[PDB]
Amino acid sequence: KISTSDPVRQYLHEIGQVPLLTLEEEVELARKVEEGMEAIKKLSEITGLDPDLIREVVRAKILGSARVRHIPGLKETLDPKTVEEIDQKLKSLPKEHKRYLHIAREGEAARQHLIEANLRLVVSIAKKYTGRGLSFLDLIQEGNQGLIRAVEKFEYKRRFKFSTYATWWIRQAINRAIADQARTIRIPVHMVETINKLSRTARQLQQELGREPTYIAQEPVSLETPIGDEKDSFYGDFIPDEHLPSPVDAATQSLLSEELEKALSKLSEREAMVLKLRKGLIDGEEVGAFFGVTRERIRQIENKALRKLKYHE
Amino acid sequence: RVEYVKKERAGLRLPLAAWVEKEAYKPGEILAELPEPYLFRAEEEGVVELKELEEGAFLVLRREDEPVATYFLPVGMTPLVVHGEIVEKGQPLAEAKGLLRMPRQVRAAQVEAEEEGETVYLTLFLEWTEPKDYRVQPHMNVVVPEGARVEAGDKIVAAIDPEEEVIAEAEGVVHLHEPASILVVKARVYPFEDDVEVSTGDRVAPGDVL
């Protein structure tokens, strides 16, 4: 049926079976996770294997069976035939060494019980990002990418709990992706709350002032839309073209870029690069153009640089 | 709950000919039957001391400060607080009723008898389990199961700060009172003692080595 309430009764049903007790049940799981953390590290010494290799063999045996083959540094390995070689080389390590395993199992499995219980947090974090540029299921899944990415890092040793430690990482992966996948172009990380900030003065001046005043952002209209008397035309149908080849692009920038570096290096690099990269690399400014001189000497050397650069006497 | 089964050894005097001492007698078990009365000499004198019990009473006597007398009274004997040292004149005026005790929480094991005349001085073993509890916080970990003893260095519960964690005392049986809730899982309990297993998660029926 309609998938609005289905993820909800899918979350709120094991979150209703496991609404974590704020101290007993929450801190129990975070310990086991860190229990499994170091037990894997100590198993990496005894066996001579990658730590994240070991955590990943644990994950595969806990979930029963899966095909989720990915490791940093290693992308793949024979999964269903070799994970059991790994599990039996673990059956050989004695009583002293197998308890690290027993703890490593219980720790990563509690990691899932941890997450699966804390997803109603994600439900009410993404609920304040409703009309932002992503569907509500894209938001929760970006929020569930954060609560997972908060489980690698949490330290139960410091007494502040996980309910407030994960709100940051969840609201960090949400604001990660809204700045990415909301409009067609990969928008700056900046312009998000520059566009969002004018939209909250426009609704604090249009509340009263009644005026639309004086003193790189717009929204796409689709290609097919019935124009006219809500007829059969599509809007791409009335677009003729300007030209095919699009010249002075490649042959120009090829001259353009190489003849830049020529004069750019023939005067002092402390001179030419101050503006090469200020006006050309990230932003702009000249209230802080200065790597450490007066706002007056930078304007001095800036202009004087270009002038000997423009014409040499 | 920690039960610190502290031990001591105390004497008593019986009817000589009446068979009133058996080894099949444990805590809460019979001693002696129907001597009408008892008043005989437990020959010592010392400063009066008495310690409480649920069903029982010690009497220790420190003349100066050394424990001159340690004689236990199974209930059914009528004690008097501060009597006796007139001439050490058989103060143990514990009245032999028609019944005897039978110390329910304190166990009566070993036995020793020097036989003479009317009465035998008996020396035995006395272990009374002291119920003393602790309270665990959210950040405290119960490293001990549903019942096992403990050594003088054999830490019981670990917490966040090394500041006052539940370190182990003299040996005690570990019982648990208050859970925060209760799991009822349909499973099969398979205890092991000596050697190592296959870990949590895998499949078994009956599988191999369990």
Domain CATH code at residue A260: 1.10.10.10
Q: Which of A24, A94, A106 sits opposite B138 (nearest CB)?
A: A24
How many degrees, rounded to 5, is the angle at CA A181 between CA A177 and CA A187? 90
Domain range for A202 is 187-219
Three-state DSSP class for residue A91:
helix
How far does Cα A263 stand from its chain's mean position? 40
Q: What is the dihedral of CA B63, B64, B69, B74, to 10 degrees?
A: 90
**Residues near B18 by Cβ (< 8 Å), separated by ≥ 6?**
B32, B33, B34, B35
Q: Residue A89 belongs to what H/E stretch?
A: helix A79-92
Discontinuities in chain A (C→N > 2.5 Å), after residue: 215, 284
* Nearest C-alpha in B relative to A62: B201
Residue of A173, A181, A220, A179 lying closest to A196 (CA atoms): A179
Q: Are strands B119-122 and B131-132 parallel, antiparallel or unpaired?
A: unpaired
Dig out the tokens for A74 from the structure: 């290693």
Tell me, yes or no, whether A240 lies in a domain: no
Separation between Cα atoms, residue A203 and residue A45, nearest integer Å: 61
User: Is there a single domain that holds both residue A130 and residue A193?
Assistant: no
How far does Cα B206 stand from its chain's mean position? 44
**Residues near B88 by Cβ (< 8 Å), separated by ≥ 6?**
B43, B44, B45
How many degrees, rounded to 5, is the angle at CA B69 between CA B67 and CA B73? 125
Query: Which residue in A18, A20, A24, A108 has the most chain B C-beta atoms within 10 A of its own C-beta, making it the best mutation to test that interface?
Result: A24
A92 among the known binding-site residues? yes
Q: A14, A117 in Cβ contact below 8 A?
A: yes
Tell me, yes or no, whether A59 lies in a domain: yes
Q: Which of B138, B139, B199 sits opposite A101 (nearest CB)?
A: B199
Dig out the tokens for A270 from the structure: 């402390």
HSE of B142, CA atoms in CB hemisphere, 13 A: 19
User: Is there a single domain that holds both residue A33 and residue A114?
Assistant: yes
Q: A102, A62 in Cβ contact below 8 A?
A: no
Crossing angle of helices A269-276 and A250-266, rounded to 10°: 140
Tell me, yes or no, whether A255 lies in a domain: yes
Q: Residue A47 belongs to what H/E stretch?
A: helix A24-47
Chain A CB contacts of B199 under 8 Å are 90, 98, 101-102, 105
Other C-beta atoms closer than 10 Å to the C-beta of B98 total: 9
A87 among the known binding-site residues? no
Q: Is A91 on the interface with B (CB under 8 A)?
A: yes
With CB atoms and an 8 Å threshold, state whether B139 touches A101: no
Tell me, yes or no, whether A72 lies in a domain: yes
Tell me, yes or no, whether A145 lies in a domain: yes
Query: Which residue in A89, A97, A101, A162 has the most chain B C-beta atoms within 10 A of its own C-beta, making it the best mutation to test that interface?
Result: A101
Tell me, yes or no, whether A283 lies in a domain: yes
**Residues near A263 by Cβ (< 8 Å), separated by ≥ 6?**
A272, A309
Q: Which of B139, B180, B197 sits opposite A21 (nearest CB)?
A: B180
User: Is there a single domain that holds both residue A252 and residue A275?
Assistant: yes
Q: Which of A91, A95, A102 sits opposite B200 (nearest CB)?
A: A102
For tokens 């917490």, the residue is B159
User: How many structural domains compose chain A?
Assistant: 3
Amino acid at position A113, single letter: H
Dig out the tokens for A62 from the structure: 């806990």
Q: Is A131 on the interface with B (CB under 8 A)?
A: no
Dig out the tokens for A15 from the structure: 């979150």
Q: Is B201 on the interface with A (CB under 8 A)?
A: yes
**Residues near A313 by Cβ (< 8 Å), separated by ≥ 6?**
none
Shortest Cα distance, chain A CAs vs residue B197, angstroms: 8
User: Is there a single domain that holds both residue A31 and residue A99?
Assistant: yes
Q: Are strands B7-8 and B125-128 parallel, antiparallel or unpaired?
A: antiparallel
Shortest Cα distance, chain A CAs vs residue B168, angstroms: 23
User: Is there a single domain that holds both residue A209 and residue A255?
Assistant: no
User: Is there a single domain that holds both residue A171 and residue A90?
Assistant: yes
Interface of B with A in 137-196 (CB under 8 A): 138-139, 141, 160, 180, 195-196
With CB atoms and an 8 Å threshold, state whether A105 touches B138: no
HSE of B133, CA atoms in CB hemisphere, 13 A: 6
User: Is there a single domain that holds both residue A63 and residue A175?
Assistant: yes
Q: Torsion-angle region of residue A308: left (phi > 0), alpha (psi -120 to 50) or beta? A: alpha
What is the SS3 assignment for A243-270?
Answer: CCCCCCCHHHHHHHHHHHHHHHHHCCHH
With CB atoms and an 8 Å threshold, state whether B160 touches A95: no
Residue of A135, A168, A163 lying closest to A149 (CA atoms): A168
Shortest Cα distance, chain B CAs vs residue A89, angstroms: 12
User: Is there a single domain that holds both residue A210 and residue A257?
Assistant: no
Other C-beta atoms closer than 10 Å to the C-beta of A272 total: 19
A135 among the known binding-site residues? no
User: Is there a single domain that holds both residue A125 and residue A271?
Assistant: no
**Residues near A39 by Cβ (< 8 Å), separated by ≥ 6?**
A99, A100, A101, A103, A104, A107
Separation between Cα atoms, residue A146 and residue A115, nearest integer Å: 11
The size of the A-B interface in CB pairs under 8 A is 34
Q: A177, A134 in Cβ contact below 8 A?
A: yes
Q: Is B197 on the interface with A (CB under 8 A)?
A: yes
Cβ burial of B193 (10 Å; 0-12, 13-18, 19+) is: exposed
Other C-beta atoms closer than 10 Å to the C-beta of B114 total: 8
Separation between Cα atoms, residue A231 and residue A252, nearest integer Å: 45
Tell me, yes or no, whether A302 lies in a domain: yes
Other C-beta atoms closer than 10 Å to the C-beta of A263 total: 12
A5 among the known binding-site residues? no
With CB atoms and an 8 Å threshold, state whether A24 touches B202: no
Q: Is A105 on the interface with B (CB under 8 A)?
A: yes
Cβ burial of A276 (10 Å; 0-12, 13-18, 19+) is: middle
Separation between Cα atoms, residue B171 and residue B3, nearest integer Å: 8
How far does Cα A233 stand from its chain's mean position? 40
Amino acid at position A221, single letter: V
Dig out the tokens for A45 from the structure: 């010494």
Residue of A119, A86, A117 lying closest to A104 (CA atoms): A86
Q: Measuring CA to CA, how many Å separate B170 from each of A7, A89, B125, B151, B167?
A: 55, 41, 18, 6, 10
User: Is there a single domain that holds both residue A144 and residue A169?
Assistant: yes
HSE of A24, CA atoms in CB hemisphere, 13 A: 9
Separation between Cα atoms, residue A49 and residue A56, nearest integer Å: 12
Separation between Cα atoms, residue A219 and residue B168, nearest integer Å: 70
Tell me, yes or no, whether A253 lies in a domain: yes
Other C-beta atoms closer than 10 Å to the C-beta of A95 total: 10
User: Is there a single domain that holds both residue A151 and residue A286?
Assistant: no
* Nearest C-alpha in B relative to A157: B160
User: Is there a single domain that holds both residue A290 and residue A278?
Assistant: yes
**Residues near B78 by Cβ (< 8 Å), separated by ≥ 6?**
B93, B94, B95, B97
Does the bond joining B206 to the residue before it have cis omega, within 30 degrees of 0? yes
Alpha-carbon torsion A45, A47, A49, A54, what sign?
A: negative
